[PDB]
mmCIF file with all atom_site columns, C-alpha atoms in Angstrom:
data_model
loop_
_atom_site.group_PDB
_atom_site.id
_atom_site.type_symbol
_atom_site.label_atom_id
_atom_site.label_alt_id
_atom_site.label_comp_id
_atom_site.label_asym_id
_atom_site.label_entity_id
_atom_site.label_seq_id
_atom_site.pdbx_PDB_ins_code
_atom_site.Cartn_x
_atom_site.Cartn_y
_atom_site.Cartn_z
_atom_site.occupancy
_atom_site.B_iso_or_equiv
_atom_site.pdbx_formal_charge
_atom_site.auth_seq_id
_atom_site.auth_comp_id
_atom_site.auth_asym_id
_atom_site.auth_atom_id
_atom_site.pdbx_PDB_model_num
ATOM 1  C CA . UNK A 1 1  ? 3.499  -12.090 32.162  1.00 8.59  ? 1  UNK A CA 1
ATOM 2  C CA . UNK A 1 2  ? 4.308  -15.196 29.908  1.00 7.61  ? 2  UNK A CA 1
ATOM 3  C CA . UNK A 1 3  ? 6.114  -13.816 26.859  1.00 6.65  ? 3  UNK A CA 1
ATOM 4  C CA . UNK A 1 4  ? 9.441  -12.003 27.572  1.00 12.01 ? 4  UNK A CA 1
ATOM 5  C CA . UNK A 1 5  ? 8.768  -8.610  25.951  1.00 11.98 ? 5  UNK A CA 1
ATOM 6  C CA . UNK A 1 6  ? 12.380 -7.422  25.841  1.00 9.28  ? 6  UNK A CA 1
ATOM 7  C CA . UNK A 1 7  ? 13.471 -10.602 24.001  1.00 9.84  ? 7  UNK A CA 1
ATOM 8  C CA . UNK A 1 8  ? 10.500 -10.297 21.662  1.00 8.72  ? 8  UNK A CA 1
ATOM 9  C CA . UNK A 1 9  ? 11.151 -6.582  21.016  1.00 9.81  ? 9  UNK A CA 1
ATOM 10 C CA . UNK A 1 10 ? 14.708 -7.435  20.051  1.00 12.80 ? 10 UNK A CA 1
ATOM 11 C CA . UNK A 1 11 ? 13.615 -10.168 17.662  1.00 8.01  ? 11 UNK A CA 1
ATOM 12 C CA . UNK A 1 12 ? 10.987 -7.860  16.081  1.00 6.16  ? 12 UNK A CA 1
ATOM 13 C CA . UNK A 1 13 ? 13.623 -5.230  15.481  1.00 5.39  ? 13 UNK A CA 1
ATOM 14 C CA . UNK A 1 14 ? 15.803 -7.816  13.874  1.00 3.16  ? 14 UNK A CA 1
ATOM 15 C CA . UNK A 1 15 ? 12.960 -9.200  11.710  1.00 2.00  ? 15 UNK A CA 1
ATOM 16 C CA . UNK A 1 16 ? 12.292 -5.595  10.557  1.00 2.00  ? 16 UNK A CA 1
ATOM 17 C CA . UNK A 1 17 ? 15.921 -4.893  9.626   1.00 2.00  ? 17 UNK A CA 1
ATOM 18 C CA . UNK A 1 18 ? 16.175 -8.256  7.911   1.00 2.00  ? 18 UNK A CA 1
ATOM 19 C CA . UNK A 1 19 ? 13.122 -7.830  5.768   1.00 2.00  ? 19 UNK A CA 1
ATOM 20 C CA . UNK A 1 20 ? 14.058 -4.245  4.741   1.00 2.00  ? 20 UNK A CA 1
ATOM 21 C CA . UNK A 1 21 ? 17.621 -5.418  3.923   1.00 4.56  ? 21 UNK A CA 1
ATOM 22 C CA . UNK A 1 22 ? 16.585 -8.272  1.781   1.00 5.78  ? 22 UNK A CA 1
ATOM 23 C CA . UNK A 1 23 ? 14.121 -6.291  -0.214  1.00 5.92  ? 23 UNK A CA 1
ATOM 24 C CA . UNK A 1 24 ? 16.667 -3.663  -0.916  1.00 2.04  ? 24 UNK A CA 1
ATOM 25 C CA . UNK A 1 25 ? 19.311 -6.250  -1.772  1.00 2.00  ? 25 UNK A CA 1
ATOM 26 C CA . UNK A 1 26 ? 17.136 -8.225  -4.126  1.00 2.00  ? 26 UNK A CA 1
ATOM 27 C CA . UNK A 1 27 ? 15.913 -5.059  -5.867  1.00 2.26  ? 27 UNK A CA 1
ATOM 28 C CA . UNK A 1 28 ? 19.565 -4.080  -6.265  1.00 2.00  ? 28 UNK A CA 1
ATOM 29 C CA . UNK A 1 29 ? 20.534 -7.455  -7.662  1.00 2.00  ? 29 UNK A CA 1
ATOM 30 C CA . UNK A 1 30 ? 17.517 -7.501  -10.021 1.00 2.00  ? 30 UNK A CA 1
ATOM 31 C CA . UNK A 1 31 ? 18.035 -3.985  -11.336 1.00 2.00  ? 31 UNK A CA 1
ATOM 32 C CA . UNK A 1 32 ? 21.672 -4.889  -12.060 1.00 2.00  ? 32 UNK A CA 1
ATOM 33 C CA . UNK A 1 33 ? 20.695 -8.117  -13.832 1.00 2.00  ? 33 UNK A CA 1
ATOM 34 C CA . UNK A 1 34 ? 18.010 -6.536  -16.012 1.00 2.00  ? 34 UNK A CA 1
ATOM 35 C CA . UNK A 1 35 ? 20.418 -3.867  -16.925 1.00 2.00  ? 35 UNK A CA 1
ATOM 36 C CA . UNK A 1 36 ? 23.004 -6.189  -18.476 1.00 2.33  ? 36 UNK A CA 1
ATOM 37 C CA . UNK A 1 37 ? 22.786 -5.299  -22.140 1.00 4.64  ? 37 UNK A CA 1
ATOM 38 C CA . UNK A 1 38 ? 25.086 -8.099  -23.542 1.00 5.62  ? 38 UNK A CA 1
ATOM 39 C CA . UNK A 1 39 ? 23.956 -11.372 -21.864 1.00 9.97  ? 39 UNK A CA 1
ATOM 40 C CA . UNK A 1 40 ? 20.785 -12.445 -23.663 1.00 5.00  ? 40 UNK A CA 1
ATOM 41 C CA . UNK A 1 41 ? 20.715 -16.171 -24.453 1.00 3.21  ? 41 UNK A CA 1
ATOM 42 C CA . UNK A 1 42 ? 18.288 -18.734 -23.093 1.00 2.00  ? 42 UNK A CA 1
ATOM 43 C CA . UNK A 1 43 ? 20.566 -18.988 -19.986 1.00 3.76  ? 43 UNK A CA 1
ATOM 44 C CA . UNK A 1 44 ? 19.911 -15.323 -19.050 1.00 2.66  ? 44 UNK A CA 1
ATOM 45 C CA . UNK A 1 45 ? 16.257 -16.253 -19.547 1.00 2.03  ? 45 UNK A CA 1
ATOM 46 C CA . UNK A 1 46 ? 16.573 -19.279 -17.270 1.00 4.01  ? 46 UNK A CA 1
ATOM 47 C CA . UNK A 1 47 ? 18.110 -17.050 -14.537 1.00 4.83  ? 47 UNK A CA 1
ATOM 48 C CA . UNK A 1 48 ? 15.649 -14.197 -15.047 1.00 4.74  ? 48 UNK A CA 1
ATOM 49 C CA . UNK A 1 49 ? 13.112 -16.660 -13.877 1.00 2.00  ? 49 UNK A CA 1
ATOM 50 C CA . UNK A 1 50 ? 15.120 -18.122 -11.049 1.00 2.00  ? 50 UNK A CA 1
ATOM 51 C CA . UNK A 1 51 ? 15.490 -14.508 -9.839  1.00 2.00  ? 51 UNK A CA 1
ATOM 52 C CA . UNK A 1 52 ? 11.756 -14.036 -10.257 1.00 2.21  ? 52 UNK A CA 1
ATOM 53 C CA . UNK A 1 53 ? 10.924 -17.036 -8.066  1.00 2.00  ? 53 UNK A CA 1
ATOM 54 C CA . UNK A 1 54 ? 13.300 -15.655 -5.485  1.00 2.00  ? 54 UNK A CA 1
ATOM 55 C CA . UNK A 1 55 ? 11.604 -12.285 -5.602  1.00 2.00  ? 55 UNK A CA 1
ATOM 56 C CA . UNK A 1 56 ? 8.209  -13.933 -5.166  1.00 2.00  ? 56 UNK A CA 1
ATOM 57 C CA . UNK A 1 57 ? 9.378  -15.959 -2.212  1.00 2.00  ? 57 UNK A CA 1
ATOM 58 C CA . UNK A 1 58 ? 10.800 -12.910 -0.491  1.00 2.00  ? 58 UNK A CA 1
ATOM 59 C CA . UNK A 1 59 ? 7.632  -10.904 -0.864  1.00 2.00  ? 59 UNK A CA 1
ATOM 60 C CA . UNK A 1 60 ? 5.606  -13.799 0.541   1.00 2.00  ? 60 UNK A CA 1
ATOM 61 C CA . UNK A 1 61 ? 8.055  -13.957 3.397   1.00 2.00  ? 61 UNK A CA 1
ATOM 62 C CA . UNK A 1 62 ? 7.687  -10.207 3.729   1.00 2.00  ? 62 UNK A CA 1
ATOM 63 C CA . UNK A 1 63 ? 3.890  -10.454 3.995   1.00 2.00  ? 63 UNK A CA 1
ATOM 64 C CA . UNK A 1 64 ? 4.077  -13.323 6.526   1.00 4.11  ? 64 UNK A CA 1
ATOM 65 C CA . UNK A 1 65 ? 6.747  -11.442 8.547   1.00 3.28  ? 65 UNK A CA 1
ATOM 66 C CA . UNK A 1 66 ? 4.626  -8.210  8.663   1.00 3.76  ? 66 UNK A CA 1
ATOM 67 C CA . UNK A 1 67 ? 1.630  -10.104 10.077  1.00 5.06  ? 67 UNK A CA 1
ATOM 68 C CA . UNK A 1 68 ? 3.708  -11.867 12.696  1.00 7.17  ? 68 UNK A CA 1
ATOM 69 C CA . UNK A 1 69 ? 5.303  -8.534  13.676  1.00 7.59  ? 69 UNK A CA 1
ATOM 70 C CA . UNK A 1 70 ? 1.806  -7.100  14.152  1.00 5.24  ? 70 UNK A CA 1
ATOM 71 C CA . UNK A 1 71 ? 0.707  -9.999  16.363  1.00 5.13  ? 71 UNK A CA 1
ATOM 72 C CA . UNK A 1 72 ? 3.796  -9.877  18.502  1.00 6.11  ? 72 UNK A CA 1
ATOM 73 C CA . UNK A 1 73 ? 3.477  -6.039  18.941  1.00 6.92  ? 73 UNK A CA 1
ATOM 74 C CA . UNK A 1 74 ? -0.069 -6.557  20.025  1.00 6.50  ? 74 UNK A CA 1
ATOM 75 C CA . UNK A 1 75 ? 0.943  -9.322  22.466  1.00 6.17  ? 75 UNK A CA 1
ATOM 76 C CA . UNK A 1 76 ? 3.555  -6.916  23.886  1.00 10.66 ? 76 UNK A CA 1
ATOM 77 C CA . UNK A 1 77 ? 0.326  -5.672  25.125  1.00 12.39 ? 77 UNK A CA 1
#
């Protein structure tokens, strides 16, 4: 066999935990932020967006990670 399936299984598991953790952590952070009633200048607005470009980047990572996980699981046979 070429690939080492045990090594690959372990990485897949880790990729899975990492991508579930980050989505839950960024939702958490975002729900907290948008729930601040008293910070509402143009700075809050500048961060709202910085948070949004983080959220977009994670979900693109998420999508790319899911497709790699699929390929690797297939390779495993």
